[PDB]
């Protein structure tokens, strides 16, 4: 598990870079008025690229620092919400939702870090997990409510974005509780790595697909 975790860290490092530069290269395929989301998606992968280089070295040393992961989450998760809420809102409704979902994500990740840096299985470990779960469900319930009246190609493209978050973000609570299911300290970092790749690269690809539809492409 130890060597597999190191290899996945190094592979995800290059995958985040590949996601960053591919998304920058693909921005020419859509109209200029829909390139902002492609650029923000590349920045998300670019930030994760910077932190996955550190996480890979941190894991290789033997003294792993999950703070590198959580500081990447607390920066990138609100950024990923910026373009999701843009599809359905603008003006005051947008700024409110962006602010509120960003506060919720920060509490979720902060509570998770409080619990993950506690003793595994302790009351603090569970306190962080329960608080993070409740804010997570609040975020997912809000997300499902977004884009209710949409129809056509834009609705299907937005539903793919929504379902990627609704399904792909479940990997994180499973990773957090993997250390108390078995001798699976490294499996937690395996699941965190796979989820970041699926959710960061995958969202960027879907946002790119949303920009193609908005550009009138079939």
Ligand X SMILES: *C/C=C(C)/C=C/C=C(C)/C=C/C1=C(C)CCCC1(C)C
Ligand Y SMILES: CCCCCCCC/C=C\CCCCCCCC(=O)O
Ligand Z SMILES: CCCCCCCCCCCCCCCCCCCC
Which positions touch ligand X (CB under 6 A)?
A: 73, 76-77, 108-109, 112, 129, 132-133, 136, 169, 172-173, 176, 196, 199-200
**For residues 199 and 169, is the Cβ–Cβ distance under 8 A?**
yes
Nearest one of 99, 97, 83 to 205, comparing CA atoms: 83
- Using the rule CB under 6 A, which residue among 11, 184, 198, 215 binds ligand Y? 198
127 to 186, contacts with ligand Z by CB under 6 A?
164
Please list, in sequence order, all residues whose beta carbon lies within 8 angstroms of the beta carbon of residue 126, skipping any fewer than 6 positions away: 115
Interface with ligand Y includes 71 (CB under 6 A)? Answer: yes
Q: Select the binding partner of residue 78 from ligand Y, ligand Z, ligand X, none (C-beta < 5 to 8 A, by kind).
A: ligand Z
What is the CB-side half-sphere exposure of residue 135 using CA atoms within 13 A?
Answer: 18
Q: What's the CA gap between 65 and 63, in Å, rounded?
A: 7
Q: Which stretch binds ligand Y (CB under 6 A): 38-46, 78-86, 134-142, 174-182?
A: 38-46
3-state secondary structure of 120: coil
Q: 92 or 196, CB closer to ligand Y?
A: 196
Which among ligand Y, ligand X, ligand Z, none contacts residue 102 (Cβ within 5 to 8 A by kind)? Answer: ligand Z
Q: Choose, by CB under 6 A, the member of 86, 98, 107, 190 that binds ligand Z.
A: 98
Q: How far apart, in Å, are the Cα atoms of 217 and each of 34, 35, 194, 206? A: 12, 14, 31, 14
CB 38 within 8 A of CB 204: yes
State yes or no: residue 11 binds ligand Z (CB under 6 A): no
Contact footprint for ligand Z (CB under 6 A)? 74-75, 78-79, 82, 98, 102, 106, 164, 198, 202, 205-206
């Amino acid at each position: 598990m130890e060597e597999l975790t190191y290899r996945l860290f190094m592979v995800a490092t290059v995958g985040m870079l590949a996601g960053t530069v591919f998304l920058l290269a693909s921005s020419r395929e859509v109209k200029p008025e829909h390139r902002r989301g492609v650029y923000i998606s590349a920045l998300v992968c670019g930030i994760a690229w910077y932190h996955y280089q550190k996480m890979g070295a941190s894991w290789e040393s033997g003294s792993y620092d999950t703070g590198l992961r959580y500081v990447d989450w607390v920066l990138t998760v609100p950024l990923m919400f910026v373009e999701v809420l843009a599809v359905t809102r603008k003006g005051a409704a947008y700024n409110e939702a962006v602010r509120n979902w960003g506060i919720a994500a920060t509490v979720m990740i902060g509570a998770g870090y409080y619990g993950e840096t506690s003793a595994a299985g302790s009351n603090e470990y569970w306190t962080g997990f329960v608080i993070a779960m409740a804010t997570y469900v609040w975020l997912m319930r809000n997300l499902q409510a977004e884009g209710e009246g949409l129809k056509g190609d834009q609705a299907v493209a937005f539903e793919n974005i929504k379902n990627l978050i609704l399904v792909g973000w479940i990997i994180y609570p499973l990773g957090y509780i993997a250390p108390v299911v078995g001798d699976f300290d490294a499996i937690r970092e395996v699941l965190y790595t796979i989820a970041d790749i699926i959710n960061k690269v995958g969202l960027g690809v879907l946002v790119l697909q949303m920009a193609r539809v908005q550009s009138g492409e079939k």
